[PDB]
């Protein structure tokens, strides 16, 4: 199995004891490290800030400590949106400029591959033709990587893509059989499934549906999402399941209604370190529990939640990661991706479960081994 781990460029800018740098990464923890994110300018991949080049050096320098470790550079994400990708795939010239820039950039900075993270082809303003054009881009990029490998007599660069977790988004953006042919891996975004607009508490990444879920809400779970990708032609071995190292928060309408599906008012207030309304890092959830929140296990969804007063959080813990890792192995999947590694308890100071409790759980349960480790 694979165990991929995201490192986000902005984690180092958090308050110091919650800040994370590539040097704080245990080189033997993961099989792949993904740097989020590269930028784009003039249809070419590029760095977003001057400091990113020092980050690339520190991250890729970890390969001297684990010679089997692979690194990937991600481009895109939710905040970047669809418009730069729609323009880049629109013409063969623009796609060639991009692909050539990627080969030069990854080789210069010692990355092992690219992770495409277009959110999303075919939605958010991206027209229906982008579902076809994204598939064309991926095929052309895989061909160019194969050609470079043969010409230079060096291992081929890896090509991965994220894959939506929302069924309607998958339908409008992904030619699944063709994408599965050309990609090395599809990183399925089995998280942010809390449906904040619904007006009820929901889990960020439940393994199974709640008995309270109806209609499309019954598909907002790991099992249904991965089943959809496999039923529509994705290779099981290429599917990498998203494992979030955070939860989502809500304000309850009634402090006496605290379960899953309880009425809500809004997202919860930002955490001291992550500073994002509606989100808490796993290490921040540990503070919430340490300071008195009531912890509950929901067996139908196989995930925890916690509450205090009118504050409620749905998240993932060691138990839910262990049950999901067993499910992953039982279903012959390719592995897992931790999103983001910098929200796991990297220091061990918040949760008292040693360094990286969530990711270390997957390392052991997925039998991750490297001969250099």
UniProtKB/Swiss-Prot annotation:
Binding site for chitin: 49-50, 76-79, 120, 189-192, 339
Keyword Signal assigned: yes
InterPro entries: Chitinase_II/V-like_cat, Chitinase_insertion_sf, Glyco_hydro18_cat, Glycoside_hydrolase_SF, Glycosyl_Hydrlase_18
Keywords (A to Z) from UniProt: Carbohydrate metabolism, Chitin-binding, Cytoplasm, Disulfide bond, Endoplasmic reticulum, Glycosidase, Hydrolase, Inflammatory response, Lectin, Nucleus, Polysaccharide degradation, Secreted, Signal
Description of what induces expression: Up-regulated in response to IL3 and IL4, during the inflammatory response and upon parasitic infection.
Family: Belongs to the glycosyl hydrolase 18 family. Chitinase class II subfamily.
Protein known as: Chitinase-like protein 3
Organism: Mus musculus (Mouse)
Name of the gene: Chil3
